[PDB]
Amino acid sequence: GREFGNLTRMRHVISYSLSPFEQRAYPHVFTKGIPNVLRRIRESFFRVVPQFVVFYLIYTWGTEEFERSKRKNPAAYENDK
Amino acid sequence: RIAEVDASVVREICSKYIYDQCPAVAGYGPIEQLPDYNRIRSGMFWLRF
């Protein structure tokens, strides 16, 4: 059906490609690799993190408040006097 | 020099230049079913031999 012999038509778009053995498996890793990952992280960062940061505040609060809810047993007896 | 040629010489030289070598490819189209270059390069050698 949708085999390679019959898909989308396209017209003169030339392309170029080296043999795997003709080139290094790790081209310019430091000069270009790491900064790319850093740019990518800088793009995703503000989109992703803050909700999780919001989650943490709630997580901390919930445990802490529950601590006030229970561990502050003495507040109730203190209320008794 | 042609009479000197023998099947062992043929297989020897053809193994010397064809077997497990990296092909150069030029395809003027239409093309899409033509194998990607890794399929060709892996098509250059048998796993039986």
Keywords:
part of a larger assembly; 2 chains; A: 81 residues; Single alpha-helices involved in coiled-coils or other helix-helix interfaces; elongated; B: mainly alpha
Q: For the terminal residues of chain A, how far apart are their CA atoms?
A: 85 Å
User: Sheet with the most strands of chain B?
Assistant: none
Number of domains of chain A: 1
> Which structural class fits the helix and strand makeup of chain A?
mainly alpha
The best one-word shape of chain A is elongated
PDB class: oxidoreductase/electron transport
Keywords: Respiratory, OXIDOREDUCTASE-ELECTRON TRANSPORT complex
Entry title: Cryo-EM structure of human respiratory complex III (cytochrome bc1 complex)
Chain A: Cytochrome b-c1 complex subunit 8
Description:
- Chain B: Component of the ubiquinol-cytochrome c oxidoreductase, a multisubunit transmembrane complex that is part of the mitochondrial electron transport chain which drives oxidative phosphorylation.
- Chain B: It is found in: Mitochondrion inner membrane.
- Chain B: This is Cytochrome b-c1 complex subunit 1, mitochondrial.
- This is part of a larger assembly, with chains A (81 residues) and B (49 residues).
- With 81 residues, chain A is mainly alpha-helical.
- In chain A, 60% of the residues lie in helices and 0% in strands.
- Chain A has a single domain, classed as Cytochrome b-c1 complex subunit 8 (Single alpha-helices involved in coiled-coils or other helix-helix interfaces, Up-down Bundle).
- Chain B has 49 residues and is an all-alpha fold.
- In chain B, 33% of the residues lie in helices and 0% in strands.
- Chain B is elongated and about 45 Å long.
- The two termini of chain B are 30 Å apart.
- The interface between A and B is small, with 9 and 7 residues.
